[PDB]
Design a binder for this molecule. Sequence first.
Ligand SMILES: *[C@@H]1O[C@H](CO)[C@@H](O[C@@H]2O[C@H](CO)[C@@H](O)[C@H](O)[C@H]2NC(C)=O)[C@H](O)[C@H]1NC(C)=O
Lengths: 116, 6
Amino acid sequence: AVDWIGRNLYWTDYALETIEVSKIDGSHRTVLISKNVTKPRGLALDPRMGDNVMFWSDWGHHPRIERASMDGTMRTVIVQEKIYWPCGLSIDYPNRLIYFMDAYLDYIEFCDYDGH
Amino acid sequence: XXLXXX
Ligand SMILES: *[C@@H]1O[C@H](CO)[C@@H](O[C@@H]2O[C@H](CO)[C@@H](O)[C@H](O)[C@H]2NC(C)=O)[C@H](O)[C@H]1NC(C)=O
């Protein structure tokens, strides 16, 4: 996921079990989130000023979809109840909804930024 | 199909 406003590049690594950020040209690279990350696949961003949040999905032994600030500070879990294999994320910017899918329960769902 | 991409 690219950050068209901040000019940054985000990606999730399955083998390294990390979430990393770098400039658009890839000049500077750091590991953003590695604490409770097991199998990150999905990733989405809302760079518009005032939201500045990022989303990712993990399908480890306790699968969940987590929200955090795009600097990785305010990390929180929004969806943890009815997911087995979270696979792929996307954001509906005008309505501020996040669309996510599951490959084990086989559904497509959408939800707001707070999980409600 | 196994979920692992590799
Ligand atoms: C990483 O995961 C662990 C385990 O879920 C978290 O530890 C829990 O933290 C909550 C509060 O957020 C407590 O209510 C639980 O009792 C804790 N469990 C244990 C066994 O310690 C930990 O907070 C998470 N850390 C990060 C950085 O996300």
